[model samples]
Target: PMKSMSESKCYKNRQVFPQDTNHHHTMFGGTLMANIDEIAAITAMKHAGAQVVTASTDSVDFLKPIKTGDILQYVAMVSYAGTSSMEVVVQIRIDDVFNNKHDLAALSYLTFVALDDEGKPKHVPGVYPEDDVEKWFYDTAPQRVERRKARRIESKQTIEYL
Candidate 1:
């Protein structure tokens, strides 16, 4: 069965506490990444109908620094799916209501592998792109998959050299 992108969309909000910020009063990259990972995992699991683990953080681009007082909104969607793996896209939005500032903070592409109770990869439902936006994601996913394959081959070569 194929599921639409909306079927696994996830949304989360976080208020950046002082503790989550660095001495410079900006949220640390680790904090944002953790939030992205958590939300992405949730989206993937919802799509998979089972537990999932982070296979890779395929890509992340930080567009703006998040201030300490900003409210962060995490929008995540399961963009693509394979037999046992899924691609989750996350966009971080910064909302500073007091100053009336809202902007895109970061974008991330993450991969997760659905797992059974025994922790082995398991088959999951397929994905059907419902609209033009989703179709774009579906059409371009093969490029990302090929890039990942190239990276794995390069990594293996480096490991063998070592």
Candidate 2:
């Protein structure tokens, strides 16, 4: 399915804006992440056919700080899927150079899980990739699931743990 970049409001040309200054400027990593997560949910719903909530985000090391006037972009695709939950890996990058063809920037990965009306994980249906690039991403179980599992445990610890 063809989608438009502008569909998500926060998306820019690999750079994001309304930046703060060194004097009193701070881009709370959580804030940046929240925006990315919302957009990721939108994309997930578009693909997954239901509402999604953020299950987890892992191992995000901010490589650099973004100053004012930086164009940012987020590229996301479904990374993995289970019967009830699907993961989306969204990369956030900054535009170091802008061109008619390419607007490139820094990059980071964000993950999200889609859920169902009962608040359980739900299956993503009819997800057929028409291209080779899509096939490769979905081919295997992906790497180091155990490492990701530990990270997920650490993240889960932060919740209220009701």
Candidate 3:
């Protein structure tokens, strides 16, 4: 079965507080990173309709700093799917109500593998994009997948050396 990208899309909103910030009053990178994984995982699970595990965090780009009291919106969707794995992309945007400002804060890509009841990899449905934004991500995902393959080879070499 093939699923539309919009079917598995997920949205999350949070307000940055003192507790979520660092000494400089900016949102902690680690906190944001954890949230990214959580939402991306959920997106992948929704797409697969099964248990899923994070295979890798392909990349995270912190484009803009998130300050205290900022309202952050996270939009996650499955950008690509393999036999058993899916690539989830999360876009973090800062929504400033007072100034009516909305800007991208960060972007992240993650891979998740669906699991069967026996805890083995399970097949995931194919995915398609319906809109331009989704289509762009879907089209560009192959390059990212290729990069992950190359990186994995390097990782294997490093593991062997250690």
Candidate 4:
């Protein structure tokens, strides 16, 4: 079934353990990245309805440290979709259920390219904004994409600093 951003939110949860933490007893950043990638892929696919591969992690902000014993909930949604790509936003929430506390621990934006049976780029349905929130994302994604393109070109430009 075709999906709209309104219906494409995906979720997964985990309980942090000693093994998931670092020497400082906080959740490892790499672990959070992996979860973000995985969940974002799932959300992107819901929009693409085809094979998809991660193209970029546009941004990731660790807003707060997560500690062992924290119950982590990952929330993801396809915020935008282009010809063959989709942008997913993932939010990680830390919940101390016992203490009735909860807050965002991280936020990430990832892009994925849809693929066909031949493993080539494939056309994906453009996401139609269902509400005001999605409309904002749809409207702003193009500017962000353009900025990413500019950054890529700038990075590849030859520099003379001798």
Candidate 5:
């Protein structure tokens, strides 16, 4: 049997805006953020081989809003990793089923941390970036620093204190 190592993997999906903007208008800001964080947490837990909790939702840059008919495809990946934390970037591409050429969309970043059974922060195994794109995400200090800044805090505890 082939073994599935604790390597981080990306999960993506396409969502369609529900009809009836006022009556059935779906997709709230809170819902979107909840899905993003939960998905990212699962990815980190899979890679960490233990229970993981969300450290915080550091930032969310809303590039575009979902309209009544725009279909969005989301791409998620573990962009950066520390001993017990990781930064997962989720990009949303909007598409107009009515139009083809202008199908470009927006993006967002979701941060998560993996914790052990004892509740103390544990070491996360190394993640190897196989391609240039992956390498670029992991190797840059500025980008990585921005991600790390939120992890290290004065309270040293998450808002929920998880």
Candidate 6:
């Protein structure tokens, strides 16, 4: 079975409140990271058509600061699928309605693994990109995948030594 990236795409809108921000009046990094993971997990579940768990949060780059009262838009989509594993890319944008400003605030990538009822890894559908943006992410995923493999090796070595 196969699925299109558009089929598993997800979008979420949120408003930054006083509680969601820090003393600087900017959104907390942990809060944004949690939302990123939530959206990415939803996208992965849609693509995999099964339960899924976060395998690794590849990266989360904060491009711009999000302040209180800012409307945030999160866009998540599947970039690659490898057997039981899927790579999801999330883009967080600040939607300033009054100022008519919309800019990317953060970018994140996460890996997820599908699970069956028995809690074992399950096969997932293949994925294809429909638009130029999606195509770019799909095409460049191989290099990122390689980096993840290398990083995992390093992590394993560190854990063993510790």
lDDT of 1 by residue, 75-130 (tens): 88877788899988898999877888768989899999999999999999988778
Per-residue CA lDDT of model 5 for 1-162, tens digit only, reads 111222566565656555323455645666566666766667767767677777666566666656666566655666666666766666566756666533434455555666667788877765656777566656752465564585666346764586
Colliding pairs, model 3: none
Residue 59, model 4: lDDT of 88
On lDDT, the stronger of 1 and 6 is 6
List residue ranges in candidate 6 displaced over 4 A: none
- The estimated TM-scores of all candidates read 0.90, 0.64, 0.98, 0.86, 0.69, 0.97
Tens-digit per-residue lDDT, 31-146, candidate 6: 99999999999999999999999999999999999999999999999999998999999999999889888899999999999999999999999999988999999999999999
C-alpha lDDT of residue 155 in model 3: 94
Q: Model 5: residues >4 Å from true position, as ranges?
A: 1-7, 19-27, 95-104, 141-162
Relative to the unseen true structure, what is the C-alpha lDDT of residue 29 in candidate 3, on a scale of 0 to 100? 94
Per-residue lDDT over 33-92 for candidate 2, one digit per residue giving the tens place of the 0 to 100 score: 766676667767776677787666643556667666665566666655555555555656
Mark the regions of model 3 whose C-alpha exceeds 4 Å error after superposition. Answer: none
lDDT (10s digit) by residue, model 3, range 34-150: 999999999999999999999999999999999999999999999999999999999999998899888999999999999999999999999999999999999999999999989
Overall lDDT per candidate, in order of appearance: 0.89, 0.55, 0.95, 0.84, 0.61, 0.95
TM-score of 4: 0.86
Q: What's model 3's TM-score?
A: 0.98
Q: Please identify model 4 stretches exceeding 4 Å from their true place.
A: 99-101, 131-140, 158-162
Candidate 1 vs. true structure, TM-score: 0.90
Ranking by lDDT: 3, 6, 1, 4, 5, 2
Deviation in Å, model 4, residue 22 alpha carbon: 0.5
